Amino acid sequence: YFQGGMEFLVKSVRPETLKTATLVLAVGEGRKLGASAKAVDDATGGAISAVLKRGDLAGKVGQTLLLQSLPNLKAERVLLVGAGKERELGDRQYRKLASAVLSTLKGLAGADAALALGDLAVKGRGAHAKARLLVETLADGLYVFDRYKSQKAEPLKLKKLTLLADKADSAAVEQGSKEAQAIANGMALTRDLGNLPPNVCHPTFLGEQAKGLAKEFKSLKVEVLDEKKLRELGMGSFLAVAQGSDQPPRLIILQYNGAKKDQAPHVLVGKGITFDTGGISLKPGLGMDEMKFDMCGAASVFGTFRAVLELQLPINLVGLLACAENMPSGGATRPGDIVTTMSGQTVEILNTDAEGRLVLCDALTYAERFKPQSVIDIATLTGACIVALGSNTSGLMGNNEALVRQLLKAGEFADDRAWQLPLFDEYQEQLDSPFADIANIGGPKAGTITAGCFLSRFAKKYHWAHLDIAGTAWISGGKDKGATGRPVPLLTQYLLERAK
Amino acid sequence: YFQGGMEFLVKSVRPETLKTATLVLAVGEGRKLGASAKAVDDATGGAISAVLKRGDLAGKVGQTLLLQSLPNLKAERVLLVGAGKERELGDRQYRKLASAVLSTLKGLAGADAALALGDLAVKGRGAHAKARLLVETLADGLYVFDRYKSQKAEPLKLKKLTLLADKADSAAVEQGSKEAQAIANGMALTRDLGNLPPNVCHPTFLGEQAKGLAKEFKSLKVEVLDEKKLRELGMGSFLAVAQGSDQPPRLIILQYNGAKKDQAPHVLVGKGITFDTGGISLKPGLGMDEMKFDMCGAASVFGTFRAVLELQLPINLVGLLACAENMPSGGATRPGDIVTTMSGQTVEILNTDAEGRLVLCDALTYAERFKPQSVIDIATLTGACIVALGSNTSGLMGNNEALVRQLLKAGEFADDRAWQLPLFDEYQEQLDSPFADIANIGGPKAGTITAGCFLSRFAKKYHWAHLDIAGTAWISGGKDKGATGRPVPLLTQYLLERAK
């Protein structure tokens, strides 16, 4: 169940007799009230119709009108929210409607609210799929990160949200709500870890977080490998990234065995660069505070595990979090260094700011021992991905078409979308080095793709895919600056489908 | 038939008795000679086997060994070319093999050569598909642009190439060769127009080129509209691009009616910015000579027409070439100008270097009058596409999934590949303007996509797709700097399939 201060219930009772602090109804733009709103209007003797006739609420998506006590209702307030003029909403409009409702309710002193929104239609979504989107939007919309504020906002009075559904849909709605709550809990852990400042959130801290998660979930086993063990394993490019920082690196291994021992596991590999200065290839100063989000890949592995552990899915899951801090220093890796990866391939490190792939490639080699049926790495890897796909769609590459399709489908269902980019063999020659087996960077052309090509050289032994979340893992500026928790919804949906 | 100084023949005779200046045979790396090479070796009494045993030719793809007269052969020379160790070649290896053969033959004084390469296997390609790739690579490999060199290279002695094929395959090979020759002729026209310097290749020159093509092909009708007519049509954003230059703009209309009058036409829309300084939003000086390639979109419409006209395909085809020169001047368009497009939508021109879309959008509105069944615009539009997809894969967007799939399939067959990028509705808000209906640029995120989103607002009335060839239309540096002729092979293959 959701942990962020909200209980979500599903009930099949009549809205017009439900006791609640706020009853929420949808109002169309220039079309008749839906069945639920009409039943409530009838119960009040036409009071809602009479208000709407006065014209303050045009009915555009997300517009609101709040009424107090109406005759013959047990609702203390009635919140009208506009649903536009279309027969069906798209996902974006449904989310906008839900967020407008939540924003209003947050500011009220009501301890609960009941959503009578079952008459809304959303393109391509039945009861379960609508509940997944609605509850995830509501629950994630409650997220707060204020532990470093001396002045904290007043706690919400709102503590309970009831979804009204016809009895024939209530089981699907309940299922969707339960899954959405687990996803939102995972997103909240991901966002917390992403938002923590890098002087607190370093690799050792992430190791202790993993141990704490195992304390909470007896089904989770955790092992944390330090720099001595990494050197024993021959993890040369991983160590090269870490060596310039005072902070020691960590390889965190999470294991959950929800299925029979004969089922091959799915492996999630997360880039956990807790801060990325670029190293000797130093980044510019402007906006470099957002490099604390360079561990959002690893954070999303935490969050996906958190959701899976709550749902107790019948799957075998492994998490590999490759965490290091990338700092300049008198002992840092230099451009031109050549290192031997755990696979034995030598890499010429042309640019020390292309370091995510250097911790990932050793983790991908490590993943071979699990004989996985799928391996997915998640990383804030290339600014080129933002040029290619922006901030709303993650880049996706892989060496197996069926797995890539499974991830695309999961992202569509989750409304946490990705988009495939090709790993054509012609791109690989961009990584040729006169000195070593591989150069760690290509040119300025196709940067997201050549990063995927680099990783692919370590993933040939299994079905593998790669999510570039450089654009989707956080919001850069404004009031809403901070980690997003993506791609936890995509990944959790992928695993939900693999668990059937 | 190919016009660049080469006759291509298909014959089904035995290689070992064929009179030719050079007989070309494939030699595998560490595997037995194929059937054709073995038959020739047997005819010489083992002379080729005996040479190969000495070890000078390892057999790697494209390696060569040239022999002179061998016993009992009518070939004056025998050229051995390595074919690697795989059972089947990929497209890249097949092209590399063919280019190595051609490079050797170019340097010889032989007037002809015979290719006995029928035993080569290429992944996913039968006789017709292999001949398409082989002949197009050979014919396009003969391209020369030397009209501004005072010292021209010696003319080739090689004037005839014979493809040897089994009688059961010879019809397919002949068909593939004929189509490849037409494509190569079209590519040569495209490359010529792209390579011409911008003080020669201006919009008026392109208009005269269209008139010259109609003189050569009686099935082509051409109309050239000048700035007065553009202003009568209300083509405000097109005129805004052109107004800073001394060179007047041209809208060139090509029409070919190869099918019954009841068949809706296919429309190709080409960006013909004959030079792009950026305008007031001036480009940096470094590499700005390659902005003469900013008309390669329009050039590829010329080239696709040239191939279609030679093949006399039973289709109805329209070409719209929107040509202008983008110059700074005391009357040039300024950042912040607002103009009314022919569609009536107003556009705020935030950056005068995003000018390709401003001539294209008026051409897309113009295309409505043809009631087309497909509209494809081709443009060197965004440097962001090179970041996203590099120099080897064109970006593709559209408003119709079936058309996008048809173009992807054509590019795969042609080995002139594209890759779809999404036009999700969420990207559209990047083009919001406080002052006008549309801004002409989004932010630094998803630049290729937001350019496609801008064009999509003018294409809603028909099935439309958009090819960003900023990366594939030319080669930037080195000995091979110059226009490539892409995407003529993709477009011609698309139309070949639509003609069935």
Ligand SMILES: [Cl-]
């Ligand atoms: Cl249901």
Ligand SMILES: [Cl-]
């Ligand atoms: Cl630790």
Ligand SMILES: [Cl-]
């Ligand atoms: Cl340690």
Ligand SMILES: [Cl-]
């Ligand atoms: Cl974006």
Ligand SMILES: [Cl-]
């Ligand atoms: Cl799914």
Ligand SMILES: [Cl-]
């Ligand atoms: Cl055949």
Ligand SMILES: [Cl-]
């Ligand atoms: Cl003209």
Ligand SMILES: [Cl-]
């Ligand atoms: Cl004129």
Ligand SMILES: [Cl-]
């Ligand atoms: Cl490239």
Ligand SMILES: [Cl-]
């Ligand atoms: Cl095709």
Ligand code: NA
């Ligand atoms: Na609507």
Ligand code: NA
């Ligand atoms: Na929507």
Ligand code: NA
């Ligand atoms: Na970096």
Ligand code: NA
């Ligand atoms: Na990084």
Ligand code: NA
């Ligand atoms: Na490059």
Ligand code: NA
């Ligand atoms: Na081979």
